[PDB]
Amino acid sequence: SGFRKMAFPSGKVEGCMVQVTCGTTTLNGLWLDDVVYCPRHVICTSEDMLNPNYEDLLIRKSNHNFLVQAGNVQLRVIGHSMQNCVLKLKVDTANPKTPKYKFVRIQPGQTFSVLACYNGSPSGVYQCAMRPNFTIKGSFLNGSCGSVGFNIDYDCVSFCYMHHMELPTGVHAGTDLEGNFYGPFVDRQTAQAAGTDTTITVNVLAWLYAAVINGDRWFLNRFTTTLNDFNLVAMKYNYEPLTQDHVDILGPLSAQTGIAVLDMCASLKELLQNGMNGRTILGSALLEDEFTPFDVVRQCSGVT
Amino acid sequence: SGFRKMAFPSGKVEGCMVQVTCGTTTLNGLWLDDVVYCPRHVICTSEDMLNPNYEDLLIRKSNHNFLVQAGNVQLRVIGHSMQNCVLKLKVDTANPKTPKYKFVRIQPGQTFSVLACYNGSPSGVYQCAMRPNFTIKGSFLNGSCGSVGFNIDYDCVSFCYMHHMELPTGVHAGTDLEGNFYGPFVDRQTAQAAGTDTTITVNVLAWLYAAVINGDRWFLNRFTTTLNDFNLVAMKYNYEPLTQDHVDILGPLSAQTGIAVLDMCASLKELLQNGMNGRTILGSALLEDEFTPFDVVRQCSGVT
Ligand SMILES: *CC(=O)N1CCCN(Cc2ccccc2C)CC1
Ligand SMILES: *CC(=O)N1CCCN(Cc2ccccc2C)CC1
Numbered sequence: 001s002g003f004r005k006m007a008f009p010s011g012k013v014e015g016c017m018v019q020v021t022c023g024t025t026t027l028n029g030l031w032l033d034d035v036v037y038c039p040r041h042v043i044c045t046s047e048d049m050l051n052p053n054y055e056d057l058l059i060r061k062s063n064h065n066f067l068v069q070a071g072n073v074q075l076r077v078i079g080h081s082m083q084n085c086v087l088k089l090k091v092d093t094a095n096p097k098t099p100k101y102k103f104v105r106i107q108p109g110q111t112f113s114v115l116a117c118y119n120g121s122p123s124g125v126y127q128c129a130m131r132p133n134f135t136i137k138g139s140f141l142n143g144s145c146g147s148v149g150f151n152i153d154y155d156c157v158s159f160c161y162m163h164h165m166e167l168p169t170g171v172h173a174g175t176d177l178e179g180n181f182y183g184p185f186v187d188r189q190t191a192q193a194a195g196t197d198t199t200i201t202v203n204v205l206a207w208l209y210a211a212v213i214n215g216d217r218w219f220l221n222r223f224t225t226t227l228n229d230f231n232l233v234a235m236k237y238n239y240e241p242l243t244q245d246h247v248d249i250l251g252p253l254s255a256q257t258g259i260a261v262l263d264m265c266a267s268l269k270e271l272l273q274n275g276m277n278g279r280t281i282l283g284s285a286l287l288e289d290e291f292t293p294f295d296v297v298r299q300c301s302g303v304t
Numbered sequence: 305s306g307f308r309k310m311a312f313p314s315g316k317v318e319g320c321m322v323q324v325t326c327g328t329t330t331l332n333g334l335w336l337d338d339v340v341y342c343p344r345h346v347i348c349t350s351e352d353m354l355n356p357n358y359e360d361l362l363i364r365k366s367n368h369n370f371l372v373q374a375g376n377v378q379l380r381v382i383g384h385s386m387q388n389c390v391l392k393l394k395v396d397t398a399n400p401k402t403p404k405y406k407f408v409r410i411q412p413g414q415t416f417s418v419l420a421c422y423n424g425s426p427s428g429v430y431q432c433a434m435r436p437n438f439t440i441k442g443s444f445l446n447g448s449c450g451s452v453g454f455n456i457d458y459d460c461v462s463f464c465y466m467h468h469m470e471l472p473t474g475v476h477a478g479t480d481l482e483g484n485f486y487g488p489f490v491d492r493q494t495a496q497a498a499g500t501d502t503t504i505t506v507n508v509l510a511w512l513y514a515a516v517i518n519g520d521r522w523f524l525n526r527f528t529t530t531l532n533d534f535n536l537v538a539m540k541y542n543y544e545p546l547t548q549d550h551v552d553i554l555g556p557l558s559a560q561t562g563i564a565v566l567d568m569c570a571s572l573k574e575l576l577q578n579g580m581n582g583r584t585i586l587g588s589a590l591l592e593d594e595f596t597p598f599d600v601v602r603q604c605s606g607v608t
Binding site for chain 1: 312319445446519579602603
């Protein structure tokens with residue numbers, strides 16, 4: 001019992017983190033097989049970051065200009081290419097600690113663990129969600145670029161995020177491992193405002209399911225609603241609209257708790273319309289939206 | 305920028321987790337050098353848990369009754385002893401993945417990372433505090449006993465917690481690695497009510513410092529207070545009393561932000577007396593007390 005913002009064990013990803021230095025710029029790389037993946041702005045000085053031409057900048061660089069350190073041992077770079085906003089460095093050694101892995105591009109609403117890194121050294125691990133505006137609310141200091149977000153299924157690491165950018169508003173933008181940015185963000189020091197940070201409605205409902213399962217039930221009410229009625233309330237409160245797909249995904253939690261999805265929606269509706277009245281749910285004074293139904297099932301079943 | 309509930313990278317502790325089976329009971333062990341540490345109630349059935357005599361129960365057990373599995377390879381048990389509420393199993397192999405480590409007994413207010421485990425397999429990692437009533441607010445399902453709490457300094461793991469017990473109220477009790485319970489808890493299925501869960505005042509002030517450093521400053525006011533005046537307010541709201549030691553510890557955060565500790569105390573006072581007025585601080589609608597001044601300095605400096 002008890003419910004916690006829970007990250008994947010970070011071990012398998014700790015074994016992949018390296019330091020990448022190009023001239024004076026240092027950030028983190030990800031060493032999988034005989035390839036090190038890092039943000040392409042490794043080749044920039046802050047003098048370049050206002051209007052960088054990455055193709056032109058990279059012409060000036062050679063395999064020996066990319067200093068890759070794995071602990072206190074240097075990797076020999078035998079090749080380099082630009083894929084979208086990442087560099088792939090070919091090294092002459094496969095990472096012996098390469099886990100089973102995939103690169104997956106996640107959807108907004110989906111959660112993942114970040115291993116925050118500085119000079120290829122892991123510092124901490126936390127749980128994130130891809131916000132509906134394709135930002136993540138991270139904790140990232142200078143030198144954290146190249147840190148990766150990941151999910152783990154038994155033995156298999158799915159890398160979904162590389163950290164690249166902090167918006168003036170202190171939220172975070174980055175790429176999948178093919179170097180494609182989530183949202184409209186570009187690796188350039190320019191005016192880039194985030195869209196509306198809407199609340200991930202299906203994740204709030206999953207979290208209300210988690211609450212019921214762990215004893216917090218004061219918010220359960222006598223009411224129900226319809227998808228259309230609920231969504232009128234959702235819109236007013238900048239909640240993502242709830243679909244029949246979302247309802248289907250909440251099915252197993254529905255089944256476990258014996259509370260119909262649309263009844264729980266009615267509970268959420270009254271919570272939006274009335275607030276918490278100074279009360280708390282799983283030790284939170286607001287509605288948590290960074291637990292997926294899958295996350296709730298996991299932490300309330302005990303998958304390893 | 306951004307502030308997250310952040311755990312230590314769990315890798316070094318993942319390499320130490322094993323499965324311990326005694327007859328039909330299975331839980332987690334910690335393999336350091338040629339010793340596996342697990343909760344002593346591994347020797348119990350739920351039939352024993354009402355009034356277990358551990359000395360008498362252990363007489364009936366032998367080295368070969370303690371089945372220790374590390375992945376899919378079995379460790380040979382060449383010895384066993386009871387230390388307080390832990391068993392130490394001597395194995396014929398030193399854990400090749402033993403990190404540098406210490407056993408440290410933490411004080412209430414101090415934070416640590418938990419690696420939640422089931423059948424010696426890590427499932428997730430989160431950040432905890434030893435509550436002033438010597439409970440922790442964990443997330444622990446059946447089979448999670450033996451999971452450990454830890455801190456990491458560069459290369460050195462300080463193990464402070466082994467999970468043993470869930471109180472009827474769904475909070476968690478456990479031992480240090482010498483098998484001594486935090487608080488008055490005993491590994492027995494008996495009436496055990498937790499004391500007052502007071503708020504860790506120095507950790508709230510550290511968190512307010514973190515907020516200021518990350519841009520959230522609406523709660524800064526024109527007032528100051530005294531240690532004695534503040535503590536009258538602390539008592540009323542079941543906040544731990546603030547000492548000159550707490551003020552000394554907040555010194556570096558004070559220095560960085562240019563806000564005097566007693567001014568910030570006055571900010572906290574008005575927050576207690578007036579609440580948040582439906583506002584938030586670092587994305588929280590209540591006062592977070594599970595970040596130590598040391599945690600704030602770390603996440604706002606970037607230690608690895
Ligand atoms: C993430 C990190 O290590 N750094 C801090 C922020 C990114 N920065 C480069 C930069 C600056 C402005 C706009 C875009 C980018 C990519 C330096 C490294
Ligand atoms: C933690 C774990 O794996 N288990 C669930 C709770 C502990 N339990 C044994 C028990 C039961 C009641 C009171 C005390 C104790 C130690 C079984 C294993």
